[PDB]
Amino acid sequence: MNIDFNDPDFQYLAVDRKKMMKEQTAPFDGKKNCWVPDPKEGFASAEIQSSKGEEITVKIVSDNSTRTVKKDDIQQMNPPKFEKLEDMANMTYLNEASVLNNLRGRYTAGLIYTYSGLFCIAVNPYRRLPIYTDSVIAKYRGKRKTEIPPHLFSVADNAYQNMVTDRENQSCLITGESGAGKTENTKKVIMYLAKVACAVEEEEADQKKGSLEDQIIQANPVLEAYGNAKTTRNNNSSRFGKFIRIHFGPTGKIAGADIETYLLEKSRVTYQQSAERNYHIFYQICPELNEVMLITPDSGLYSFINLTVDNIDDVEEFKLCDEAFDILGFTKEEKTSMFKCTASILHMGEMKFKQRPREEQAESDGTAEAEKVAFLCGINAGDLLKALLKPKVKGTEMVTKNLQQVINSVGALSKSLYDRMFNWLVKRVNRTLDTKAKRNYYIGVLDIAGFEIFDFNSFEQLCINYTNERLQQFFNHHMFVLEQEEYKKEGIQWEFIDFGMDLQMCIDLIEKPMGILSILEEECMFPKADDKSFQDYSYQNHIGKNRMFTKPGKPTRPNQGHAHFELHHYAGNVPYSIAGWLDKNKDPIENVVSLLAVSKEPLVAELFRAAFQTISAVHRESLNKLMKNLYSTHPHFVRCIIPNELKQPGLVDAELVLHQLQCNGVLEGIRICRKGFPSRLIYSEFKQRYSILAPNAIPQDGKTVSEKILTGLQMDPSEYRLGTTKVFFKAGVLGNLEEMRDERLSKIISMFQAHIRGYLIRKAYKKLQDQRIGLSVIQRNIRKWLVLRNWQWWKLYAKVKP
Amino acid sequence: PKLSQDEIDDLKDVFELFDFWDGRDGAVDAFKLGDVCRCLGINPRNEDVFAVGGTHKMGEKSLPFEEFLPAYEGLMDCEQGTFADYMEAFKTFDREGQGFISGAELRHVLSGLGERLSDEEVDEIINLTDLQEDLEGNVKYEEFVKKVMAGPYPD
Amino acid sequence: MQEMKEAFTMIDDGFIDINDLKEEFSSLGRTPLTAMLKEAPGPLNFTMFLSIFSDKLSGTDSEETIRNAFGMFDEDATKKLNIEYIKDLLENMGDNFNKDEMRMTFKEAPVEGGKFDYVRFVAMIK
Ligand SMILES: [Ca+2]
């Protein structure tokens, strides 16, 4: 016959006992045995019974107990016929707890790549086993989720296959909190996509210098420099939305790179929350010209910055960075005349120069410092001011009719600045590899922070949650299309609601015009910017008027509940807090770009012009420019690790991973999954496994057998659906078809066991009654004798027969 | 329920034959009654017998005709298996569908799963019914499910 | 048949009223009264001899039958049942044996290695 399995696939991807030759345990105990959730540990295997009221009083393996639980905390978890799988979507009992173990069971059972629909959950074993090699690679031409177990080469080879094939353009979202290797895959692939990109001339190999894949993550530190690497509640958050947008040929060939950005934490520079250190590089830099000017090392002063920690050493980032440069677009006429341009910021950080005893005006005061930047940057520490502290609006008619500004005018420039001059890095960085000759289209790997809900929530948090949330729904929608069809590709179909559009509710809470976005935005020009003014106002509706969101509620973790209202997306609800928000939407816009023009230094000129508002403004234009740039493509999702803080490559950390999944979209993936008709099986894979269920209820085809087995069971017609090749069941009905089978098989064995011990008695019958006669004779007979040898007319019957 | 006189009859006639093999005194030990009904046609299960008296220890409780008779009326009902039913059990074990089962595995079911059959049995049973292996060392359950159901006396 | 109608020598008038024996049977042991002739309702004769006497042979089987009766519990034609088996087939089966009936039975009932021989037993029990 056959199919296939193993061999070696000795990643191991391999096989703990190839399963059903030696198993142990079947009867299971499914009304009994599945896990309670607690907390130490998350949930845990167990037994059940109490029939209490009311909770329980049963428990786990190992340990245990006399413990009380209820019904929202019980859960249950898949008969062994639902042990360590792949699609995970194909999984009766799609509960929060259940999930996990099919992954824990991958670490402690060496393996860490599972599907959950499209989601390519994958872990960091960070021991670097033979996984990525070539007694591995060597295949998947267009092999799909099912023509090869997990690994990303799927997302690789069939986002790939989807490429060429299909037609249009790919994409792909990468998630993973600050751990795994996102720095890779995004890195570990390419190697792939490329191997298979030019293995469809240039032999000399001399063009094989900067390598491919392991090249553009070269620039990394000039990018990732500005870039990123070190924040506060984590430490290497490339604080920008990347997108290794590499381009694709017209002939199923590669065809370049490309790459942009979205949301660069302007803020980061002007404001900061201490350990909330601003961008790895300033320090990783502050010999031969380690001066060439202006102050040098240690915060103390130089604000907009006002310090490193473990094996961070800002050392090498430097010297060991200068040159990498020199392979692309620049001959030390920029490379060099572009750092000052950096240092040219720290200066303003040298705050103050006052107001007026009372007169609303501001003083030019200091300006002994401004000079330098008016020397670094260009122009002259006087070129400005006026049209910087009291300018003239342009039909001409120059005017000058505030102090509180400037600081903003700065805590705006430094931003705007730093902003422009990154777009810059990009501009060229890719140039070298930007053979923009153009040969249509490409894949795309995306990257951006991933929704953070914790201890405190500010105008910072609310932004990502504004990103991801809106991000997600792109996913949902997508999935609303891969089902939308299918049923369609399966004769069945049951119109539903674009789940993706259940989140909108919340995306359409802020982005929404009279959403909050604008009631926060505008409310910056507004001179009466109390914050409180802001507070209630957002109300003056919303609170009791939206549906989605709330007022705080109460405590959760350490410290108390010094909250400030609650907002909720997927990934639960979040307790944000405004305060310094209006103070910080802060970015306003000049007067000759408030100058920067010419200076005969375009290093600071052709980074300006080739008004007076805030950051959200420009955010949404980025974001959308990221959505209305995404919603027209072929998504893909890959998620990451976060096994255990102290990198014990061994395994786990439920809550820590539970944490995650409670984002990405996975948990939200079963939420919707669990909403429709998961659990899928072509009838053949059913007939078999489920025939004991109506044995005497079949004639003795496939799609026919299966029906009597459904009909014979009184199965609720709403729990199932019969397309036309396979049958979809409600959320975990397959379970019941394992509570029954499992139990309605034992009842078949015994019925036999017993049909074969009636056969032994019904066999011994005559042998048995014969026995009686033969026995009732001995007794009778022993007694007739023994009755005799003690009678008398016998006893002395022939003491001598005469 | 509601025996007849060609039915209620072969009962006492058996109850009798079984009341004597534990001492003729007008009664029958429970335990040994599950083996009364077997001979009497029906194929009740352990649980089945227990759930009407059928002790575990021989000599724990002994039923007199009447007091016994009733509990016989209710064993008839009990889910008496069937080909298709039986036939499946061996199939969910037929990792081939070819219609076989390594005697190994086979003697595993009858022994391990469900109501364990005395390891005393089986060999016994497979040995009158005669269940000869064959080349591979496996059996063709089918002819066996039939054989066992055919009773010890065929045609 | 008539190896029956014999005797009448050694016993004691005409049909020997009382104490046929006594004179006739103390020449060797230490004899018994008036029951060994109280249980002689009769009286005497040869009349209902075949009646009262004998016919007390009811159920009394052939020594080929009883021997066979045993055979059904040892058809490995070993011509032997293991003690316990019998010791149990009698004490707890059919019309079970009283601790005494039993005590007597297995008195000179031949056994060896725990192996009873019904194939003599009969012979000795007639
Ligand atoms: Ca009895």
Which of A3, A22, A696, A756 to mutate: most B Cβ within 10 Å? A756
- Tokens for C71, please give them: 């055979």
Neighbours of chain B (3+ CB pairs under 8 A): A, C
Structure solved via: X-ray
Same domain, residue pair B73 and B12? yes
Would you say B27 is a known binding-site residue?
Answer: yes
Direct distance between the N- and C-terminal alpha carbons of chain B, in angstroms, rounded to an integer: 30
Do residues C38 and A793 make contact, with C-beta atoms less than 8 angstroms apart?
no
Residue A243 burial (C-beta neighbours within 10 Å; 0-12, 13-18, 19+): buried
**Helix, strand, or coil (residue A568):** strand
The domain boundary residue, chosen from B59, B80, B101: B80
Q: For residue A281, how far is its CA from the centre of ligand 1 (angstroms)?
A: 99
Any chain A CB within 8 A of the CB of B86?
Answer: yes
- Topology (CATH level 3) of domain A460-628: Methane Monooxygenase Hydroxylase; Chain G, domain 1 (1.20.58)
Cβ contact, residue pair B20, C92, below 8 Å: no
> Is B151 in Cβ contact with A772 (below 8 Å)?
no
Q: Tell me whether residue A180 is annotated as binding.
A: yes
Do residues B98 and B39 share a domain?
A: no
Resolution (A): 3.2
Report which of A98, A131, A130, A142 is spatially closest to residue A116, judged by C-alpha positions: A98
Produce one character per residue of C56-74: b if its CB has 16 or more CB atoms within 10 Å, e if not. Answer: eeeebbeeeebbebbbbbb
Give the Cα-Cα-Cα angle A362, A363, A368 (nearest 5 degrees). 140
Give the count of domains, chain B.
2
The answer to whether residues B114 and B134 belong to one domain is yes
Residues A697, A714: contact at Cβ < 8 Å?
Answer: no
Residue B62 and residue B103 in one domain: no
* C-alpha span between A347 and A333 (Å, rounded): 23
* Alpha carbons A428 and A439: distance in angstroms, whole number: 20
Residue A183 annotated to the active site:
yes
Catalytic residue among A116, A158, A178, A278: A178
Question: Which strands form C111-112's sheet, in the order they lie side by side?
Answer: C81-82, C115-116, C111-112
> Which residue in A766, A770, A776, A778 has the most chain C C-beta atoms within 10 A of its own C-beta, making it the best mutation to test that interface?
A778
Distance from CA of A64 to the nearest CA of B (A): 28
Domains, chain C, in order of start with CATH, read 1-58 (1.10.238.10), 59-126 (1.10.238.10)
Residue in A141, A189, A163, A158 with CA at minimum distance from that of residue A251 = A163
CATH homologous superfamily, domain A339-426: Myosin VI head, motor domain, U50 subdomain (1.20.120.720)
Residue type, A389: L
Instruction: Say whether B91 and A750 touch across the interface (CB within 8 A).
Output: no
Could you list the residue range(s) of the whole structural domain that residue B42 is in?
Answer: 3-80
Task: Say how far apart CA A217 and CA A220 lie, in whole Å.
Answer: 5
Residues B65 and B133 in one domain: no
- Orientation angle between helical segments A461-484 and A615-627, nearest 10 degrees: 20
B58 touching A, CB under 8 A? no
Nearest to C72 among A771, A780, A801 (CB): A771
**Residue count of chain A:** 802
B148 and B116 share one domain: yes
Instruction: Confirm whether A450 is a catalytic residue.
Output: yes
Give the CA-trace dihedral at A450, A456, A458, A463, to 10 degrees: 10
**Nearest chain C residue (CA) to A791:** C36
DSSP sequence for chain C: --SSS---SS----S--S-SSSSTT-SSS-----STTTS--S-SSSGGGTTTSSS--TT---TTHHHHHHHTT-TTTTS-EEHHHHHHHHHSSTT---HHHHHHHTTS--EETTEE-HHHHHHHH-
- Which tokens go with A50? 């109490």
Q: Which helix (H) or strand (E) element contains residue B28?
A: strand B27-29
Chain C CB within 8 Å of residue A765 CB: no
How far is Cα A90 from Cα A670, in angstroms, rounded to an integer? 10
Asked whether residue B62 falls in the same domain as residue B88, the answer is: no
Cβ atoms of A752 and B81 closer than 8 Å: yes
CA atoms within 13 A on the CB side of A715: 25
Active-site choice (A6, A64, A234, A724)? A234
Which of C6, C104, C126 shows the shortest C-beta gap to A802?
Answer: C6
Q: Do B17 and B37 lie in a common domain? A: yes
Residues B51 and B69 both lie in one domain:
yes
Give chain C's end-to-end CA distance (angstroms, integer). Answer: 18
Cβ within 8 Å, pair A801-C66: no
Instruction: Give backbone dihedrals phi and psi of C116, rounded to 5 degrees, phi first.
Output: -75, 145
In this structure, are B75 and B135 located in the same domain?
no
CA distance A157 to A255: 18
Q: Which CATH class is domain A674-754?
A: alpha beta
Residue B69 sits in the same domain as residue B98: no
| Residue B130 belongs to domain with CATH number | 1.10.238.10
Residues B74 and B23 in one domain: yes
| SS3 of residue A790 by DSSP | coil
- Given B80, B108, B142, the domain boundary residue is B80
Nearest to A482 by CA among A119, A99, A93, A103: A119
CA–CA–CA angle A171, A172, A173 (5° rounding)? 140
